[PDB]
Amino acid sequence: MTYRVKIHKQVVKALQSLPKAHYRRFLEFRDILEYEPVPREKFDVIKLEGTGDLDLYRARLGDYRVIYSVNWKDKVIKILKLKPRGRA
């Protein structure tokens, strides 16, 4: 439970367009995020904006990418938005 994970409303909606399989992967990402805020190896994550307070990150789940923030002080991880494979 280390970290509390929250999802933005619009992400939840976009999540329903995903195949059962992809959704399952997202839930695993959520489960891991609660223990490890930056699972670099397993999700090829990169720090977008680092600022001592909240950091922005980009995780790769395969067919798509998820961008989220980590509030170290409050221990809150927020799933901000989703993105395509990366058109290249």
Binding site: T2, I7, R30, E36, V38, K47, K75, L80
Partner: protein
């Protein structure tokens, strides 16, 4: 309780330390712009915009 919360606290600090040691970076797809909007969103605390991930559905299969 008090001993374990301290232990969890330490774990967090250590994790944020390694995060600190990570270089900033983007993908073509992501602009400084969008990053600004993202920090903006990240700091938005209005409930209507969020839901706990733990209350997400569990596979149908």
């Amino acid at each position: 309780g008090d001993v374990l919360k301290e232990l969890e606290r330490l774990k967090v600090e250590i994790q944020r330390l390694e995060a600190m040691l990570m270089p900033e970076e983007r993908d073509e797809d992501i602009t400084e712009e969008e990053i600004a909007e993202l920090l903006e969103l990240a700091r938005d605390e209005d409930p209507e915009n969020w839901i706990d991930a733990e209350e997400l559905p569990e596979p149908e299969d």
